[PDB]
Design a binder for this molecule. Sequence first.
Ligand code: FES
Ligand code: FES
Ligand code: FES
Ligand code: FE
Ligand code: FE
Ligand code: FE
Lengths: 324, 316, 328
Amino acid sequence: TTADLILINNWHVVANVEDCKPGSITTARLLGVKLVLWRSQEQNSPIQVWQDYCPHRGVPLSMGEVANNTLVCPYHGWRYNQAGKCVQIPAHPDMVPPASAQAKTYHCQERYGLVWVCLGNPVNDIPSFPEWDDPNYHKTYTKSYLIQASPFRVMDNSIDVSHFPFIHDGWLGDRNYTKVEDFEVKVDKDGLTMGKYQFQTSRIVIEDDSWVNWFRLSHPLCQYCVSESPEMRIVDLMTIAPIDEDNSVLRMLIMWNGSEMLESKMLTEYDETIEQDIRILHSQQPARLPLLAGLPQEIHVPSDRGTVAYRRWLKELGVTYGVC
Amino acid sequence: MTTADLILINNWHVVANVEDCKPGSITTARLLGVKLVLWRSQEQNSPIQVWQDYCPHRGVPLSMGEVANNTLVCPYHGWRYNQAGKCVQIPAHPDMVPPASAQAKTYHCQERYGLVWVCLGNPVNDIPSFPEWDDPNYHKTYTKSYLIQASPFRVMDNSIDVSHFPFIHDGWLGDRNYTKVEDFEVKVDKDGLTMGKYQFSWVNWFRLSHPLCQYCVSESPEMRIVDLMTIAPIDEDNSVLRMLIMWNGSEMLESKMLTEYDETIEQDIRILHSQQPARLPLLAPGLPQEIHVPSDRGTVAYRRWLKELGVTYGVC
Amino acid sequence: MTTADLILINNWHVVANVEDCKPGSITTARLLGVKLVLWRSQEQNSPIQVWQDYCPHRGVPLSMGEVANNTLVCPYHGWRYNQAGKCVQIPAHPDMVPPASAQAKTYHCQERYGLVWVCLGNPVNDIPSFPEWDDPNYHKTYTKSYLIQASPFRVMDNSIDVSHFPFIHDGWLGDRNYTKVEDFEVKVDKDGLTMGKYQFQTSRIVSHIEDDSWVNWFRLSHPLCQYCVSESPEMRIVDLMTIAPIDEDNSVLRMLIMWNGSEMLESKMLTEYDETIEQDIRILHSQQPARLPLLAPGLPQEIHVPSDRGTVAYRRWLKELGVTYGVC
Ligand code: FES
Ligand code: FES
Ligand code: FES
Ligand SMILES: [Fe+3]
Ligand SMILES: [Fe+3]
Ligand SMILES: [Fe+3]
């Protein structure tokens, strides 16, 4: 579509590396752009991420096939090498393909088992995830969640902490303990950091009903969360793929230093609470996130200081896509 | 799809039947482009609140919450709104007095004839009158609601139209062998529009003081039937039709009367859904202009009335 | 919606097959954003009327009515319209003189090749010619009608294209081992767009295994109809493809197929066309932008190679004709 600079020139997860097998074709959408992801059959072949579009007659390349180290358009069989250049036009086998015959290619990097894509010029680093190679931690990935809400409303809901005892009653919050103690938030050059805050709840992951959480966003659509009890530490990297201004894909990478056998329960806790959030996200109007300044204007109370700082951060960053 | 037409925004409109709103219940409706939430506390005889279905904190519909004591509680962070619409409790800050702006947008609501009437503006006009409501010799019945994909003014146009009876209502209100329409009278003054007696047996007349409500009278030597038809204007292109039917014959006719009304309402809806343009064409304006014959005098009068009232919503 | 393009409004378009308009029948169609009603009286050999599907009294579709004698009767108040579209009876006022405005909007209709052609405007062009129609050497069959969510001009672009045969029609109209496209000529002139004889290699289900060299040729005098001749040393197949432009983004494709060979080939002829038409539709539905891009020195612009000379010439011809509907 018509996204902004902090968005176009940043890295976004569009797939799990396990989604992209050798010789395979898959698709995604990012910032209004249709993407094709493909790999040759070679062992550990790299992933190409291109705009899903043959410039000859406008057919999606994802409808084609991988042949050797090339992607072949189904309509007239033009073949594109790994750099996106047309190397063969079958109707004219002795013709040099015109230089214009080329797919639009994007930057792709595999990191944390996720496929990261930059549609522009990649001036930012991929967000840090310190536990990735820590041998004390195990990992698991949630399924993806397609959410009919603005990506910035999706992240707003993930920075929100006061909703835990209501839509997450029995999982992350306690309807008996609704008060939200004070906490600190700072927005600097490291992005947005929400400081330590304690909340009363036990988790399927029992007398352990005191958890201290904090989180950081260096990237407005990624969040690194740390949730700690005396017994265990759980971290997660949530990535929100902005399909367009009104639709999102949520993925979460979870790591924990307890027993590896907790994996099933971890995925259940996250699945339950994600779907609880999605019920609210789908209902919110207007769909795009209102920035600080028909329907009434938003109201803020002190426990909204982090979601207020997020709206302020988005404005300073110059975000206009998916917001209002 | 909202309106500034005063005759619409400053008027009363039926949005529900009172039996639909039990104590402790939450229901939804739409009126003139606005999403409404209707709720009652669980105490007996509790009043009906009708609000814009929206929490001003983070934009969640209040209808997704729950009724607790005398309050409607938003599901997202549990802000509690009392029957007057004021937020009385913000659970994250139990000792804080909520901001003055933590307020639901509330609308006027009145129960009359067993229906829930709502005014979204200033209630300048009054609810249409219905004399037989106070008459112990008349039984009453309510049709189900009918959702119609047509402009509410085209819906009312079809109810003022009387020459179609022998065609789409053949066998029920008309007879294909008697198609000629005899002369009848219609006047528009500032009591509204009033169809003079006519007959296709049954002698009928009707009047509208409200452009989307109709009071019909149908009389025979045996008995007389009155109905109050109300057309809820959801937006410019969608309507909810209800009828309140009263009659002074045997009460056991109810099942048949409901069937006769159901048959002919559905015959009308088949026409209403097909008509183009969707908005009602007013007089003197790639589709040709309307044609009028003498038996259209009532629907012509209706188009003239709507122009004098200044209607622009759902009309062209 | 509608178009002011004269080449489209003042031209003839197929909207139905004559077999779907029985005496006494009412059917519907849509053409260039206009809703049509097609009807016939019960009489033997009655003509087909094609009118705007609209009663000017209160705006009801006349197609919801019924045919009575030689009139179409609106269901709402029973106004009766004769074959010329004039209202002859207003039942509420049986003695009145119906106003001149009580008249359906009527269009030009003409049955040819067993198809119903309609002109919404002033017919300055003729229905395209299909010489084999009157040849008793030739058998005929009609495909079913295919609703396609693509611009009618993209649908025709795909039918002018020949280099795609060995790919999406591999095993039917081409061979993945013979993908080179021989040279051929194209002309845009008084006749419209003509692709000269083009030889390609394939065996086909409608002929013998060794009959594996075919020669195609086609002419469009009308930008949404195509007369195509496909010939081998063993058989000659001709077809008249017609694309009904429902609106800018939706089309109805019909094909009338004739061949000079055994009448028993009919089932195989319909199988081949159905299989290849559906392969073409899979591509058509995927193409973006939806409207056909014209020539012009967001999405990257089209590239053209020499075997595109016919589809390039088509884009040039459409601009020369003044087409703006369904093109970009
Ligand atoms: S459209 Fe891709 S090769 Fe022609
Ligand atoms: S959205 Fe209603 S309490 Fe926060
Ligand atoms: S709308 Fe056709 S006769 Fe009245
Ligand atoms: Fe949550
Ligand atoms: Fe009726
Ligand atoms: Fe084809």
